[PDB]
Design a protein around this ligand. Structure first.
Ligand SMILES: Nc1nc2c(ncn2[C@@H]2O[C@H](COP(=O)(O)OP(=O)(O)O)[C@@H](O)[C@H]2O)c(=O)[nH]1
Lengths: 82, 293, 73, 96, 95, 492, 278, 98
RNA sequence: CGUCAAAGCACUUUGCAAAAGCUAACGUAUCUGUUUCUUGCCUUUUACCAGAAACAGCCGUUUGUAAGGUGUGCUAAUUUGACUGUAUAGUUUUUGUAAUCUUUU
């Protein structure tokens, strides 16, 4: 009975994530947890007021995630079903 | 010397060196791969687990991981340093007969009595590709490029398939009967092949006609899969026979060394990668290291 | 959860609390909570000027609290 | 959980820490908590300014702590398996 | 148990009402950057999946010489918003 | 006293720490008996030492330095020896036997030397199965044991600085067979960790007797029970013990699964179809975990070696406190500069009878291999230097009953096994470093709580081998405190 | 195969109750004191003999009467307890287990009163002899006096289960039983290796028996010592087993029949096998 | 879950915090709150450094995680050899025929 | 109970290896023989009396491993291991006190 369960389907695609911190992060998703803690593969993250730096295995403390900008090819109707 | 080492209980089939030239592996009907040294010629691990008899070993090009092709569909994988199991590549619905490996130790090809070729990754535990022909397959060889895979069947027709296309590009001709072992040179430029007609023919890789039909190495009622090899130079060709003789050729179409020694049918002859030594195996439970000074 | 904190040794003794917004208070420790809500009596402010205003009995919230000290050993 | 037991094990030794306040405190630790409360003595504070002070006794709230700094021998300490139905790690003879 | 009860009657029902009506929504965020879009799905935490989003947010040049208000818009196809960032929702109908 | 469950107490710790160790089937396990004589008889005889890394409530690990003492009345010698080293005494008492002789004989002798006491009521499980007393009448039988301990305290001192009671923390209810020790504080936790928020402390005060609990009002009272007032203790501890030692046993294995699922103990289905006692052990070790209570009940009452240094130095050290050695003891200096002070009491046989390890407390500084060391005696003084002898320290080792830990450098605070320093020593013998400030003093020769008395003559059966017997009789005097050799005029 | 068995509680109950007339009634072990396999070894070695027990072949200036102090003769029982002390030139000796805890379990004779009922054999428990410390507040008063109004909302662990159950009686009787029954899940011996009544000739013979018997009792006991003396610890070996070699050649076949048939079968076979030799 | 988090154990990590500071070192212990324990730690406030040692961070304080480096660090079978020999067979032809 | 991994599963027949590693019933049972010595009763040696030490056999037990057999499933069932295994939007961590501005070097 949670919208979080839909994000566990999301695995594999690339997304530009925004955080409360104000950073921006392009990278492929590997796994998503019930507590929002996502792990990413082949990442290019950029800090607020610094140059972009590539990281291999980024992972994020879910608490900090503002929003995922999902890819345009992903069908929503199919994923919203259990 | 010669060194005729004993060890196996029953018919031994396959015996190969590392790519380096520092070990043997051997194993047939025993259900036991037995590793060896080259230079104090002693045994090592008894790799135990295969519940079917072994039909083909091949060292990983790292000289650590070993791969089998049991008669019970499995293709096992072994850490030659420790001697533990890694996997059971479960796939075929019949007896596997041949294996082959690449440079990149990652990809493997196997050949069933289901008439199915299958390419394997050492990371998935499943088939990447499945090429179904019709009559049970027997011998396979993959090129150094990691592109062309050669299949040998019951029609006498060595078919050639690529990994991109997956089309019947070419079919070798003029072999009347059965193929027991393919073998690509250390160039990537020519095959070897044992037929049941006793014509140990060479073929071309790229125009694609014959080169030299060798003749003088009989197969008979036994129906073992006999082997052939290219020497480290690609000067000599080493074909075994059911006449208890290791027929070494000159590759110019001339029989040089014909050394007996075995009391039973011979199976898979090999060559050492640098120094001139010949691994020769046979149902007999024996193996030789024939040298040239 | 709800580990009732070790404030038994501070009961009926003077304190020097600090809270959020850099504001601080003196008082006799009367009672405490699961969430560290506090009961102080004879409460005296310590303004940024240093002007000390007497208030009386006061209930400080738990969340706010940064720390709690002792004036005399 | 192990990140709490390590703390309890540094009771007695001298500890450094950082709060949301911005200041760092250093002193002998007397008691801790699963909340991350603390009870210390002979503390030597050092704020953003550099201003040193002395505080005889202190209590804290964990919520206010950012991170601790712990003695070096506390890396050889045992890290146990815990279980599904246990609060404290401890070693475990029984089933699991 | 009681979660089922509030979705029909309470405050959150007007999204369920609006999102079923195929409606657009104006959302004031905690980032100081409002979101204007049409919603797909929502949750008890206000975790919302937005489609065809457009932002509205002021700016300054910040002593470029050594500045004035600039508004900027961007279209996003699909967007999962964590409800913590939301502070105020305005469920405006077309009709 | 005898067979009260001392050696089996430590075994209970060992099991939790050393995963490989398993119980011999026929006979108990008795880690820390070692000697084959101690295993034919089965009684412990020579006191052995241990050290192990024991955990606590919350989790903090301390390094205990335990010493099983022989409970047979006649080896009181080897109780007293380490008494002049240890920082406290742990007692073990049988809740069926009660407080017999050696429990008094030691309690009394222990308070004389200001040794703080920790009771451990052992063999409680037994009084639920052997005796099968009902829970209320067993409470009385427990309380009774605690009282009678104190009646032997009262005689030696009327002070209430000592006073053993579970209300305070001194007392520990444990059965070393089934594997569980608890204090009132530990039992409390159990409820508390499973049920929200109350203090452990405000709970454990009220759990001891002459107090009652109303299940209707949810509040305590001294009020004599009106109707179904039980007695806080028997309501929250005993009766939910009693159940365990009758749930497992009575083969109501359907129920146990539902109940033990409450606590999130999950057994495999083989384990119910098992065996009474070793099912019990498996349950009681999965429910009451590590013997944490008993840990917490030592680190709170038996003081750390620094704190006790002050007191311990006063009653044992003969010389002045104002001196440099008297000062170096009080601060527990761990420097190179500091004077090295030991205090050897017992020597231990090694795996062959040839040699003797020494057992001494390092009171100050550091000891390392190959150090020159003035090993004093008993009759020594500042006047004559005839007692003292120089010697080299071969091997320093930390003891663990069966295995030993080879260490390079000792430190103040610890107990140790020394290699090399034997021949000068017979009975007590302080060590002190050679290069020192003048006037190194001795440690008081132990007060044994029994005179030797019994006498026996010993001639060799063949007189040609009289040297060897003579060499042997010296070696006894080393490993047996109270023994005394004394050649008669005749030749005996 | 019929190795390994697991028995219910109530089953083991009946078996116990049916076998009662055979199996013993000691539980302690203290009973044996000078009747252990060890003691009997030392007796043998010291060439002395203890009263109820066996008696073997032998195995193998300083004294002065005027130096001794004759006070209570010193019996044979004394030498077999502390052989190194009271006896000189003590070799080939075994030292015995000095004492065990002592079992305090009396089984319920009248099975109506519950499992946990204060028995009238235990002494009252009165404590008017004692003199304790004194404090003004009093521990219990004080503990409540600090705060009487405080509460505990959760109640104990097993508040629904009662201290007794249906079989909790039967069970306690087992725990403290003689070997085979206490176990409640075993192994599976062979009928030859279940001696039944050996424990009659260990306990040691009840009074008023004729000499015919009392002598037999010893002779039985002797044997039991003499084995326990030389028992070797078994050698490591692979299993030979003749009767499964013969079964692996083509000359023997297998079938199942009645006992008495195969008794006659043998009894005949042997008749002929001698006749043909004669 | 926490299956991924155990995989990180004993690797040198780069941990950004809410303050902006970045801690670095191996990972010894891990929690359900994301409490991390780190060995031989070094902050990089920013051309800056400091040595701390053992550091225990809270969950509130942590932002992101990233691996810097990887985790830090059948006897003899029956077979026997022999020398030579190479006997000649009188007969020719295959093995089964005759 | 829950997850993940491995494996057909339970029952059974043979083969082949092992079975003090830190004082301990491989078997809570228990029998014969050989050699070397000591004593018995004895003169024909065997056959024996009843102690010792040193070797042996025999009747059994356990474990691992290999190949089999019966019954059941290979569109399943069962076993075996492993595990940092629980769900909390209202004060001590994961549904935010954040947002924003300006000056100094
Ligand atoms: N029933 C029961 N017996 C116990 C318990 N603890 C110890 N024992 C028995 O007590 C004896 C242990 O004696 P111990 O104190 O180790 O020897 P000591 O060194 O002479 O004190 C063994 O015979 C155990 O069976 C217990 O908790 N319950």
């Amino acid at each position: 009975m949670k919208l979080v369960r839909f994000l566990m389907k999301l695995t594999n695609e690339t997304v530009s994530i925004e955080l409360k911190n104000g950073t921006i992060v392009h990278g492929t998703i590997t796994s998503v947890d019930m507590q929002m803690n996502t792990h990413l593969k082949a990442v290019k993250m950029t800090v607020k007021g610094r140059e972009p730096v590539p990281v291999e295995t980024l992972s994020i403390r879910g608490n900090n995630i503002r929003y995922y900008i999902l890819p345009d090819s992903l069908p929503l109707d199919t994923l919203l079903i259990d | 010397p010669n060194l005729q080492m004993f060890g196996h209980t029953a018919e031994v089939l396959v015996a190969r060196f590392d790519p380096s030239g520092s070990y043997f592996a051997s194993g047939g009907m025993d259900r036991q791969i037995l590793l060896w040294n080259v230079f104090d010629v002693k045994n090592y691990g008894v790799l135990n687990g295969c519940k079917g008899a072994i039909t083909d070993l091949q060292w990983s090009r790292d000289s650590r991981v070993v791969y089998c092709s049991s008669s019970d569909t499995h293709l096992m994988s072994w850490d030659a340093v420790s001697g533990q199991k890694i996997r059971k590549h479960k796939g075929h619905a019949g007896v596997v007969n041949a294996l082959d490996v690449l440079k990149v130790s990652e990809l493997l090809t196997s050949v069933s009595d289901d008439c199915t070729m299958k390419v394997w990754d050492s990371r998935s535990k499943d088939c990447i590709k499945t090429i179904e022909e019709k009559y049970p397959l027997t011998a396979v060889a993959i090129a150094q490029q990691g592109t062309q895979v050669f299949i040998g069947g019951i029609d006498g027709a060595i078919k050639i398939w690529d990994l991109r296309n997956n089309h019947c590009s070419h079919v070798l001709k003029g072999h009347k009967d059965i193929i027991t072992s393919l073998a690509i040179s250390k160039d990537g430029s020519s095959l070897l092949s044992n037929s049941m007609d006793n014509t140990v023919r060479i073929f071309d890789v790229k125009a694609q006609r014959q080169l030299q039909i060798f003749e003088g190495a009989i197969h008979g009622q036994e129906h073992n899969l006999l082997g052939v090899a290219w020497s480290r130079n690609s000067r000599f060709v080493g074909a075994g026979s059911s006449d208890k003789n290791v027929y070494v050729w000159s590759a110019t179409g001339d029989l040089r060394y014909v050394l007996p020694g075995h009391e039973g049918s011979v199976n898979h002859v090999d060559f050492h990668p640098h120094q001139d030594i010949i691994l020769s195996c046979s149902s007999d439970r024996t193996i030789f290291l024939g040298e040239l000074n | 959860k709800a580990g009732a904190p070790d404030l038994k040794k501070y009961l009926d003794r003077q304190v020097f609390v600090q809270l959020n917004g850099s504001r601080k208070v003196y008082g006799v420790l009367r009672g405490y909570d699961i969430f560290l809500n506090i009961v102080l009596e004879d409460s005296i402010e310590e303004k940024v000027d240093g002007e000390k205003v007497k208030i009386g009995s006061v209930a400080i919230r738990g969340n706010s609290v940064i720390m709690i000290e002792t004036l005399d050993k | 959980s192990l990140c709490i037991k390590l703390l309890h094990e540094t009771q007695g030794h001298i500890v450094t820490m950082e709060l949301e306040n911005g200041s760092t405190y250093r002193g002998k630790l007397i008691e801790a908590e699963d909340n991350m409360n603390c009870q210390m003595r002979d503390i030597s504070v050092t704020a953003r300014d550099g201003r040193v002070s002395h505080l005889d006794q202190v209590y804290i709230r964990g919520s206010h702590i950012r991170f601790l700094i712990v003695p070096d021998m506390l890396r050889n300490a045992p890290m146990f398996k815990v279980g599904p139905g246990r609060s404290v790690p401890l070693p475990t003879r029984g089933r699991r | 148990r009681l979660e089922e009860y509030e979705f029909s009657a309470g405050p959150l029902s007007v999204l369920q009402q609006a999102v079923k009506n195929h409606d657009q929504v104006l959302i004031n965020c905690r980032n100081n950057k409002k979101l204007l879009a049409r919603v797909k799905a929502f949750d008890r935490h206000s975790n919302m999946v937005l489609e065809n989003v457009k932002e509205m947010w002021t700016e300054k040049k910040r002593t470029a010489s050594g500045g004035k208000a600039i508004n900027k818009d961007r279209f996003i196809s699909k967007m999962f918003l964590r409800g913590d960032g939301v502070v105020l929702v305005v469920r405006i109908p077309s009709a | 006293h005898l067979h009260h469950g001392k050696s089996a107490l430590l075994d209970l710790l060992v099991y939790y720490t050393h995963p490989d160790t398993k119980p011999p089937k026929r006979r108990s396990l008795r880690y820390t008996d070692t000697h084959y004589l101690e295993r034919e008889r089965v009684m412990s005889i020579k006191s052995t030492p241990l050290t192990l890394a024991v955990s606590d409530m919350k989790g903090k690990t301390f390094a205990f330095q335990c010493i099983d003492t022989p409970g047979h009345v006649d080896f009181v010698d080897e109780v007293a020896a380490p008494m002049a080293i240890s920082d406290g005494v742990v007692l073990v008492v049988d809740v069926i036997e009660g407080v017999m002789i050696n429990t008094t004989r030691i309690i009394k002798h222990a308070i004389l030397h200001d040794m703080p006491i920790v009771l451990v009521l052992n063999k409680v499980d037994r009084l639920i199965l052997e005796l099968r007393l009902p829970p209320n009448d067993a409470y009385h039988k427990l309380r009774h044991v605690i009282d009678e301990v104190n009646d032997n305290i009262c005689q030696i001192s009327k002070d209430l600085k000592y006073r053993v009671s579970p209300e305070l923390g001194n007392v520990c209810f444990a059965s070393c067979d089934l594997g569980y020790c608890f204090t009132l504080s530990s039992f409390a936790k159990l409820y508390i960790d499973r049920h929200g928020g109350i203090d452990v402390d405000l709970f454990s005060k009220r759990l001891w007797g002459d107090i009652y609990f109303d299940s209707k009002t949810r509040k305590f009272a001294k009020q004599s029970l009106d109707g179904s007032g039980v007695r806080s203790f028997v309501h929250f501890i005993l009766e939910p013990l009693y159940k365990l030692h009758t749930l497992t046993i009575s083969d109501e294995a359907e129920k146990l699964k539902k109940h033990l699922s409450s606590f999130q103990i999950y057994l495999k289905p083989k384990d119910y179809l098992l065996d009474p006692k070793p099912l019990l052990q498996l349950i009681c070790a999965s429910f009451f975990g590590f013997p944490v209570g008993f840990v917490n009940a030592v680190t709170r009452h038996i003081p750390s070696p620094r704190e006790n240094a002050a007191r311990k130095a006063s009653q044992s050290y003969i010389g002045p406190i104002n001196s440099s050695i008297g000062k170096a003891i009080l601060e527990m200096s761990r420097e190179e500069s500091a004077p090295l002070v030991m205090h050897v009491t017992k020597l231990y046989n090694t795996v062959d009878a040839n040699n003797f390890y020494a057992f001494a407390r390092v009171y100050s500084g550091q000891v390392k291999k190959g150090q020159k060391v003035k090993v004093l005696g008993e009759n020594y003084s500042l006047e004559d230097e005839e007692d003292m002898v120089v010697a080299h320290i071969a091997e320093i080792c930390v003891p663990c009953a069966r295995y030993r830990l080879h260490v390079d450098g000792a430190v103040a605070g610890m107990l140790v096994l020394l290699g090399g320093v034997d021949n000068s020593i017979s009975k007590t013998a302080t060590i002190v470093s050679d290069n020192l400030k003048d006037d190194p003093y001795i440690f008081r020769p132990i007060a044994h709580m029994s005179e030797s008395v019994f006498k026996v003559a010993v001639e060799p059966h063949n007189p040609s081998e009289l040297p060897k017997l003579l060499d042997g009789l010296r070696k006894t005097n080393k490993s047996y405190p109270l023994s005394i050799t004394k050649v008669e005029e005749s030749g005996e | 195969t019929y190795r390994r068995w697991k028995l219910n509680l109530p089953q083991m109950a009946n078996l116990h109750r049916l076998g009662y007339q055979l199996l013993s009634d000691l539980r302690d072990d203290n009973y044996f004191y000078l009747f252990n396999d060890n003691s009997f070894f030392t007796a043998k070695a010291l060439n002395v003999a203890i009263p109820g027990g066996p008696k073997f072949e032998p195995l193998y200036e300083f004294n002065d009467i005027y130096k001794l102090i004759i006070r209570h003769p010193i019996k044979t029982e004394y030498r077999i307890a502390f052989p190194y002390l009271y006896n000189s030139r003590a070799r080939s000796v075994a030292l015995s287990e000095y004492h065990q805890p002592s079992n305090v379990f009396v089984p319920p004779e009248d099975p109506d009163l519950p499992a946990f009922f204060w028995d009238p054999i235990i002494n009252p428990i009165t404590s008017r002899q004692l003199t304790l410390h004194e404090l003004d507040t009093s521990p219990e008063d004080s503990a409540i006096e600090e705060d009487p109004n405080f509460e505990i909302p959760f109640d104990p662990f097993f508040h629904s289960e009662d201290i007794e159950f249906e079989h909790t009686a039967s069970a306690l009787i087992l725990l403290w039983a003689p070997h085979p029954f206490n176990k409640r899940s075993g192994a599976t011996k062979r009928a030859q290796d279940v001696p039944l009544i050996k424990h009659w000739y260990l306990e040691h013979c009840p009074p008023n028996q004729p000499v015919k018997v009392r002598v037999s009792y010893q002779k039985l006991l002797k044997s039991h010592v003499m084995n326990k003396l030389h028992m070797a610890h078994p050698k490591s070996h692979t299993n030979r087993s003749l009767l499964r070699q013969l079964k692996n050649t083509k000359f023997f076949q297998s079938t199942s029949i009645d006992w008495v048939e195969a008794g006659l079968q043998v009894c005949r076979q042997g008749y002929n096998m001698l006749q043909l030799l004669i | 879950g926490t299956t991924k988090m155990v995989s990180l154990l004993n690797h040198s990590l780069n941990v950004t915090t809410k303050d902006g500071r970045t801690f670095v070192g191996q990972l010894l212990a891990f929690d359900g709150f994301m409490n991390l324990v780190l060995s031989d730690c070094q902050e990089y406030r920013h051309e800056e450094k400091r040595m701390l040692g053992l550091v225990i961070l809270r969950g509130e304080f942590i932002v992101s995680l990233s691996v810097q480096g990887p985790p830090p660090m059948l006897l003899s079978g029956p077979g026997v050899a022999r020398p030579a020999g190479r006997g000649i067979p009188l007969g020719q032809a295959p093995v089964g025929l005759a």
